[PDB]
Amino acid sequence: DPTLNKTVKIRQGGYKGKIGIVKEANGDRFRVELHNPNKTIPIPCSF
Amino acid sequence: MIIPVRCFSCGKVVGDKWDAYLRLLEEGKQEGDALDELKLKRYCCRRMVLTHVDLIEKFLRYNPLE
Amino acid sequence: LMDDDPVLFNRQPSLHKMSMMAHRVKVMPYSTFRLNLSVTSPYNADFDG
Amino acid sequence: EPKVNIINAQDDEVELMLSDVNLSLANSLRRTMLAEVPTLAIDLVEIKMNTSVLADEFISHRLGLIPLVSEDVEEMKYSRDCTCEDYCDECSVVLELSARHEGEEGTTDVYSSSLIKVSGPGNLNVGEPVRRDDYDQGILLCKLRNHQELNIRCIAKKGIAKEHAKWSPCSAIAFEYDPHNKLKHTDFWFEVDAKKEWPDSKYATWEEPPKPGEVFDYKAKPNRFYMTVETTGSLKANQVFSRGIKTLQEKLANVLFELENSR
Amino acid sequence: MNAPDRFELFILPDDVPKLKITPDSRVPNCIIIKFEREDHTLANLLREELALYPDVTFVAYKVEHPLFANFVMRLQTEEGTRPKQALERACASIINKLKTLDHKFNEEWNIKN
Amino acid sequence: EDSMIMNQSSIDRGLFRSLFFRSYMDQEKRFGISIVEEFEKPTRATTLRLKHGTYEKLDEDGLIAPGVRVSGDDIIIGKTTPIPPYHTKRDASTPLRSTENGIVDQVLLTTNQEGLKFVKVRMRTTKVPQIGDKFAS
Amino acid sequence: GVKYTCGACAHNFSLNKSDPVRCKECGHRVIYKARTKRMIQFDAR
RNA sequence: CCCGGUGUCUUGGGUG
Ligand SMILES: [Zn+2]
Ligand SMILES: [Zn+2]
Ligand SMILES: [Zn+2]
């Protein structure tokens, strides 16, 4: 999986337009460490 | 640090009235009267301007690192 | 941990046996433990820190 | 049957009397105007350079509080409801700011008037920085000294005050009724004589005093509600009262829809 | 760290109905209505309106916990009327009063313009 | 019982909000004539007993750069120590405290009295009042 | 390679691993790393 | 190709 630790932008949902980093990519549901709030969200790969 | 944009308690914008307040004090008006002229009638808004302390003038005196 | 699970709750210093009573857990947002106000007395607890 | 009598009016505050309604409706109108009337406000700040003495999120925090012209916001969509990828012209306004101080002396004050609208919805009067006059520099954001620069890109979005108070279209809402306490909803604290020790309402002369020998009307209800709606300039005062009523209608309409669909 | 998202006050999850009606079979003709993602703002408005209707014998609400934006209303009507229908009537009355109220403000506003 | 209700809108406009700063210091130690620790981004192939956190925020000089957000257990200063008698070094890096987050604000690089390299990393975050925080008149 | 900044005269320059820790212009021995290339976003809340 | 952990002894100030 060559998608971990690379910078990401979210294009759908309530967090649309925010920068983040892929913290964990087990399967389908990613963990993005969103730059804004101090938390790591669970998010689907379509987003 | 620098004048707040809004009154904490009620939300009326007070961040555009700081310059006007300092000028009125040079002309010899008293603090109560200066606030009156700016139409800050509720005492929640008055505390914001009357008790702010402008520290940013001090921090700027430190020569830019870059 | 989930609803209705019993847990042992305890506030030092334990001076007598009602310093340790079992409560039912109710999961809630924020970062404090919540107590119904009528149990503050046996723990000699208050909310000043 | 509801009646309104406007006591005073100007651009940013309307003082008015509201009558022949229930207390609960006057209160729900008060709450709706504070909390649920949409406005436009900065919600994302991209800092490409900030060498001022203020911390990055400190400056960003002030930006969120700047009131923006929100007149045409009803035709605009929420970001969370738009079918597009990322952000486009239909769900956001883009603003830009760039300041710098050349010279070894003096201070450059960065004001809200330097916020330049770059992109936004076509022909919609939104995303414009509030200004009293034309020579009014506006809200102080930062201060700069030699070689210090501030170059930021701001994304403004539609939102409501339930999420964050910066989207609130109103400051205070003055509100009172029954200036002579005929309904006896309060029991006055006094040392010697209650009437001399409590000041008069500013609407004491709009309602006659209670007759000394007059009997207690246990059937009287609150019926006249005087309120003043001040705004920040993000919306005009007449729009806030109108859209408060409009917003409250759709919420009740949505409840009505759900009952006739659940069968 | 444990603060919930503030947008959860008004945005409805997809698996969660905005409105849920259940019976209270302990007494005749009584329903429990659970409102999701709503406040005192909506609830108090409906409650007083309903109480002035002659065929509503009981109406009440509670916001069980301010950290969760919901409330639950209890509504009992006499044998003739069906509670759910009566709720629709209360809704339409208030929409009408606010429509009237919006109209009368507009008229008075132009005169002062 | 001595708690208090605070107006959430006042918090939103900035009431009692505060900055918080933490500085981390590290330096290279000497173990012999030419045996010194070295600041670098440690390669997984050559260094044993690596930390579990991510190393992907370090630049090539072994130091993280200002402006990057960091979370707990992330490495912000990479340093190795050689193993005495390839595959010769051992990690001696410093992770961010597990309970914290924020933005790297400024990185000082200099040398100490003994001439070896010396760094300080200051991290800033903002603490917003919430349920449980203490106040007093 | 990596951008730095002189704590005295503010000249910018780069250094690799081998070079001594000083400013080329004035010899000042206190230096600071430059701002990262990546964009930073804040929610203005 | 699984598993994967790092400190001990004292001093000073707080919290309840
Ligand atoms: Zn105020
Ligand atoms: Zn859009
Ligand atoms: Zn120099």
Side-chain angles (χ1 to χ4, degrees), chain G residues 6-11 13 23-28:
Chain G
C6 167
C9 87
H11 179 237
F13 57 94
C23 175
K24 264 61 175 298
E25 290 292 329
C26 63
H28 200 56

Side-chain angles (χ1 to χ4, degrees), chain F residues 17 61 66 106-107 109-110, chain G residues 4 29 31-33 36 45:
Chain F
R17 190 175 291 225
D61 58 358
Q106 181 165 4
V107 176
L109 176 50
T110 185
Chain G
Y4 292 95
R29 297 195 182 184
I31 67 179
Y32 297 98
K33 301 195 61 70
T36 181
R45 295 187 187 182

Side-chain angles (χ1 to χ4, degrees), chain D residues 146-245:
Chain D
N146 195 12
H147 299 108
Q148 289 171 353
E149 194 171 338
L150 189 60
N151 184 26
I152 67 186
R153 183 170 191 267
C154 302
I155 310 303
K157 297 191 178 175
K158 176 187 194 181
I160 63 172
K162 281 189 176 182
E163 189 162 1
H164 192 291
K166 69 189 180 181
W167 281 295
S168 183
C170 292
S171 59
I173 293 190
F175 181 106
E176 67 183 358
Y177 68 97
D178 188 15
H180 299 289
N181 195 25
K182 297 171 164 183
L183 297 172
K184 283 183 163 295
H185 277 180
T186 197
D187 185 350
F188 280 110
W189 188 98
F190 65 100
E191 298 175 357
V192 173
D193 180 11
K195 309 298 178 63
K196 300 191 196 66
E197 294 158 17
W198 279 92
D200 284 338
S201 174
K202 81 181 283 184
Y203 300 107
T205 66
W206 289 107
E207 290 185 10
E208 58 182 1
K211 296 183 178 181
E214 175 187 358
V215 295
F216 178 82
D217 187 6
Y218 52 87
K219 288 177 294 191
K221 292 181 175 176
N223 192 37
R224 319 179 62 181
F225 311 105
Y226 317 87
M227 61 185 84
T228 307
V229 177
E230 301 189 20
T231 77
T232 58
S234 68
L235 293 181
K236 290 187 301 177
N238 65 354
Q239 299 183 358
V240 163
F241 192 88
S242 289
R243 300 181 194 195
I245 296 174

